[PDB]
A paper describes a structure:
S1V2-72 Fab avidly bound B/MY04 EHA2, a postfusion HA2 construct, and we used the resulting complex for single-particle cryoelectron microscopy analysis. We selected classes corresponding to both one bound Fab and two bound Fab; the latter refined more readily in three dimensions than did the former, and we chose the corresponding three-dimensional reconstruction (from about 60,000 contributing particles) as a reference for further refinement in CryoSPARC, to a final resolution of about 5Å. We used AlphaFold2 (AF2) to prepare a model of EHA2 with the sequence of the B/Malaysia/2506/2004 HA2 ectodomain (residues 23 to 181, H3 numbering) in its postfusion conformation. Independent docking of the three modules (EHA2 and variable modules from AF2, plus the constant-region dimers from the DH270 UCA) produced an excellent fit to the map. The center of the epitope is a β-hairpin, residues 129 to 141, at the membrane-distal end of the postfusion HA2 rod. In the Fab complex, the tip of the hairpin fits into a shallow cavity lined by the three heavy-chain CDRs, with additional contact from the light-chain CDR3. The apparent interactions outside the β-hairpin are between the tips of both HCDR1 and HCDR2 and residues around the position at which the HA2 polypeptide chain folds back on itself when the extended intermediate collapses into the postfusion conformation. The flexibility of the hairpin in the recombinant EHA2 construct precludes more precise modeling at this stage. The hairpin's conformation in the prefusion structure is nearly the same as its average conformation in postfusion HA2, but the trimer interface in prefusion HA would prevent Ab access. The bend of the hairpin encompasses Gly134-Asn135-Gly136, a sequence conserved in HAs from both lineages of IBV, plus all IAV HA subtypes except H7, H9, H10, H12, H15, and H16.
Antibody (Ab) responses to IAV/IBV infection or vaccination are largely directed toward the viral hemagglutinin (HA) glycoprotein, which mediates viral attachment and membrane fusion with the host cell. The HA trimer exposes its three, independently folded, receptor-binding “head” domains at the membrane-distal end of an elongated “stem. The structure of a Fab from one of the IgGs (S1V2-72) bound with the “EHA2” recombinant mimic of postfusion HA2 defines the epitope as a β-hairpin loop; this β-hairpin is also present on the prefusion HA trimer, but it is occluded at the membrane-proximal end of the molecule. S1V2-72 IgG does not neutralize infectivity in vitro but confers Fc-dependent protection from lethal challenge by either an IAV or an IBV.
Residue numbers in the entry:
A (entry chain L), G (entry chain N): 1 to 110, 115 to 213
B (entry chain A), D (entry chain B), E (entry chain C): 23 to 181
C (entry chain H), F (entry chain M): 1 to 132, 141 to 219
The structure:
């Protein structure tokens, strides 16, 4: 059963008006006035935005306007806002008691990092293990390089850096976990986490003290 | 002496030949009938093929009606549950709902939320065909064959 | 409030079976259909089926026929979706949604239940403190499967709290950390404790953070 | 001498003549088939003309039933609006009534005041004809033609 | 001298005799057609006899549906009286009750306490026969008669 | 009380269009059909059509197809009949009537709206007194179109009151008189004032009568 | 669409029993049990009298009885009264969502006038106009003649006399408006209005004084 065709992603500036299309067959969109548009944020369940091709659930902003023409539904968002950056799905009844979701569309909008370097805890060292945690947040876009340094040398051993992940404030976050035995934690004088975002490099540093 | 044997020999060959000319026509006449009759029969068969289609079309019109009614009945009963008129746990109402749903038939299609839509198999053109009643088997005819006469050779008087 | 509360995340081995519950609240349990969807992380939504709570009648997508069952307990206003013969592709967030009379409106949506199919051993997390306006946190280390839920002082506060995405270590065990910013004047004058739950392992544990 | 040439000329003339008697019969026999078979075909056509009408009659029996149910459902639904059971502004009830009125078909006739009467096209005689099931195309038959014999001229032994 | 009366006398009877053999075939050819067509016609009648039965079966399918809807409607209305939603003495409700009861048709059977059940004449085999639509009058054929040649007597040259 | 209230009389030119309202009261506006009739003065009644307030189904007579429209406002419970391409024959009293489920009963009837199709101009009346048991009255003179409604002392009395029919002057303007008999002992001790309305011109005017 | 055939008018004395028929086709009267009878007084809307071929509206007197046979309805009124003098209309459903009225029947039963002469008002004279108003009421039958007399000469200039108009008490009323210039109001000594009904002549008279 063919998923309804949606654009992969769309972009726009704040305050602009944009539209996302969802094309299908006559049997699903054209034949039935039961198309709905749902928004979803990262780490959040989908939220219904439009139903029955125009109808607005209570609490939904006026800026979201649904429409249908032939076998093609459309959702127009006037006056683009920060909260609008999200994934959006069309869903239509496809006959024979069946409902089909579209391929989805990522609406994106057209930020320095916030580094936090935490050392191995006392308990972890007592547990014959050690880990340095480098936490990055509130950087836009989601493209960042992370580097680990033992005193003044690149470590690279078991760094375990996560991918950038979108935030609720249209920014990104990440974490790096340099795991190592405590034996080389007291040995090396200090440990540095360097984070490059769009050339700009910010470094945190700690030591056993 | 002039032998007249040739004169009599000229006669009989005509009676055979003309007779053969009749026979050859007659067989063709038989064929002329037999070819035509099969065309008529097949034509009638085509008409039967038409008629049966209408029956099937009419049968679809029955099923759609069954879908039209029962769902509309169920939609009412559920509505009586929706507005709190009858207890949703009213066993009689639930039994009615089950019995109706058992009688839905094929064309009924659940669309969601206790709602059933009728996927009409007999479309508008189907209904127009049924109501038009434009069946006509048409006329039928078969040929009639002219009489054939056998000619004796006219004895040419050499006067 | 009209709400749907789904069961916690589940991990199963291939070929096994999983059951996800969805408790309804704030409305007539029998006055709507319950529709079941799935979405792989980072992918689009996939419709699975629906169930009538009033009668128990169900419809499954042809893809899921023979592997998915839908039932309900009306006494507790709960639906149940059971998937058998689990496979790797079945690893996804599964959602229940309420659908209204003659509407295309799936409203409200459950929070989602993450189901994971992998071949794997359940292990509770190791909690460590992360001491120092100043920031402080809790390191959740060496657990499997995802996810875990972290609060601070039993949800008493949310300002500055940031849960980070977990990392899949090379050893097949996960780790994350939860950090929160506090004024440096509150150090030593307020007891700050992170409360962490790993429902697959059922590891409720508290950890206070001090200098 | 006695001229026997008259005898042979008499003989062949018989063989021709007798043969003609077969031929003219055979053509008639051909015609005897044809005019009969056309009567059969048309008769069969008439049977088809009956069957089609029966279908049309049954179609009317369908249409009246559509009027019979839907209006009655409306008669129930409107009564629920009249008895104050459900709000007259109940949007689901209004949509249901609109659906029902859209499904009425041609046979129903609005008698004013939200009520419809079924103008039954398939009358009592129609229903009796349908329930009778007395259709019968009947039997068909064709003639059997006997052999025809041609006679040689009997040479009269002048004893 | 040799009497040649035997020679020519042999010839004519052959031209006669061969002709008779053609006639005996041609007559047979007529019968050869006539027997087959009667079998064809009856076959068509059999197909017609099938078609009529389908209509009767489909008529039963109508009647059961008439019993299906109205009785269910009645069973709904009685519930509205049983639940006390509308007054049991409500004249409109009782009028709808009586009108629905009048439209019950033949397929409905009362079971006491105002309840009815549909006695389904068109059973599951009936429905499958209607829905399959496996009607086929089939093809028809008639023979083709070949030409016949009448033989003259070869004058035997006494070599 | 079950009642219908129609709009005031209207004057239009040929080819124009008019709209007549009929406000319902005392019952469920959606529980009846509204049937529209017209009657030329002194002639028989002519059925025009009906409208369903509930669903909006409207039937027009074949005579009135293409010129007449039927609508309603269920919020104020007011049907509306719009006639287009007006002609002289359309000049008539138009009535709305409530009609009840499974009844031929047209009950109650509106008071009627007088539609007048002519090439003409609206003009208000001139009110003159008519002083002297004795009878006293008011002369309404030189107005157009019909009708006008007269009360005495704002309808405080009706005994002896007799509103006479109007006459069409050779100038084409209308005039009537409204009179009442009063005892001769009430003269100079009771103020008598006639109150007249000409709704097409909308001239509510009072006139006190004295000896 | 054919109007239902009713008698043009009927007559009957008080206390008698009379009947009005309404004939139509089978398609309208015979095939439908939706024949109704309505009463209409002059200057008043129709009032329902019978419906559904026998049914009597509440408040309607028992004297009125409806009946139907074939395509012919009949309304019988027994014990005829003063109030019964009025127009009566049959109305029936005529199929295809159509309703048809009858031609109507004027029921009439089997009186000297009341003259009132008013002179021109003071304001109207100041308005450079004068009108003499002759008002007639409560005369039976509705046949009347009116004449004007300037002093003792027939004026005939702009008399404007209405037709007799039925009253609520089964009697008749009329009005005449003799318009004239104020110049020819003061000069003439007197002005009289004569009204003849059934031979009897009644005259009123006014003067400028």
């Amino acid at each position: 059963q063919s998923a309804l065709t949606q654009p992969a992603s769309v972009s726009g500036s704040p305050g602009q008006s944009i539209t996302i299309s969802c094309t299908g067959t006559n049997s699903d969109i054209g034949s039935h006035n039961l198309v709905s548009w749902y928004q979803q944020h990262p780490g959040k369940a989908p939220k219904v935005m439009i139903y029955d091709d125009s109808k607005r659930p209570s609490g939904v902003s006026n800026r979201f306007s649904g429409s249908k023409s032939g076998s093609t539904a459309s959702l127009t968002i006037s006056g683009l806002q920060s909260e609008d950056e999200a994934d959006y799905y069309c869903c239509s009844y496809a006959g024979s008691s069946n409902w089909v979701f579209g391929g989805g569309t990522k609406l994106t909008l057209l930020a320095a990092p916030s580094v936090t370097l935490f050392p191995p805890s006392s308990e972890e060292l007592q547990a014959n293990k050690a880990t340095l945690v480098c936490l990055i947040s509130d950087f836009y876009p989601g493209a960042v390089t992370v580097a680990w340094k033992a005193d003044s040398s690149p470590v690279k051993a078991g760094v375990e850096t996560t991918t950038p992940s979108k935030q609720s404030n249209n920014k990104y976050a990440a974490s790096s976990y340099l795991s190592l035995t405590p034996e080389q934690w007291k040995s090396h004088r200090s440990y540095s986490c360097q984070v490059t975002h769009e050339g700009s490099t910010v470094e945190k540093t700690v030591a056993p003290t | 002496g002039y032998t007249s044997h040739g004169a009599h020999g000229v006669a009989v060959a005509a009676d055979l030949k003309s007779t053969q000319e009749a026979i050859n026509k007659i067989t063709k006449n038989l064929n002329s009938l037999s070819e035509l009759e099969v065309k008529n029969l097949q034509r009638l068969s085509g008409a039967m093929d038409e008629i049966h289609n209408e029956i099937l079309e009419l049968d679809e019109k029955v099923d759609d009606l069954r879908a039209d009614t029962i769902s509309s009945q169920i939609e009412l009963a559920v509505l009586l549950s929706n507005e709190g008129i009858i207890n949703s746990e009213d066993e009689h109402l639930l039994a009615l709902e089950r019995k109706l749903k058992k009688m839905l038939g094929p064309s009924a299609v659940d669309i969601g939320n206790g709602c059933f839509e009728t996927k009409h198999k007999c479309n508008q053109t189907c209904l127009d065909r049924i109501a038009a009643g434009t069946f006509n088997a048409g006329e039928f005819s078969l040929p009639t064959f002219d009489s054939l006469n056998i000619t004796a050779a006219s004895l040419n008087d050499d006067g | 409030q009209v709400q749907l509360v789904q069961s916690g995340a589940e991990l199963k081995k291939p070929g096994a079976s999983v059951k996800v519950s969805c408790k309804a609240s704030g409305y007539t349990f029998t006055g709507n259909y319950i529709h079941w969807m799935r979405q792989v992380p980072g992918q689009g939504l996939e419709w699975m089926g629906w169930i009538n709570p009033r009668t128990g009648d169900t419809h499954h997508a042809q893809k899921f026929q023979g592997r998915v069952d839908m039932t309900r307990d009306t006494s507790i206003n709960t639906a149940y979706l059971e998937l058998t013969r689990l496979e790797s592709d079945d690893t996804a967030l599964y959602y229940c949604a309420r659908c209204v009379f003659a509407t295309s409106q799936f409203d409200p949506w459950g929070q989602g239940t993450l189901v994971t199919v992998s071949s794997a051993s359940t292990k509770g997390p190791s909690v460590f403190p992360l001491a120092p306006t100043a920031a402080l946190g809790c390191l959740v280390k060496d657990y499997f499967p995802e996810p875990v839920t972290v609060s601070w002082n039993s949800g008493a506060l949310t300002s500055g709290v940031h849960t980070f995405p977990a990392v899949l270590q090379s050893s097949g065990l996960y780790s994350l950390s939860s950090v929160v910013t506090v004024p440096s004047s509150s150090l030593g004058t307020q007891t700050y404790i992170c409360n962490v739950n790993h429902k697959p392992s059922n590891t409720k544990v508290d950890k206070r953070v001090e200098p």
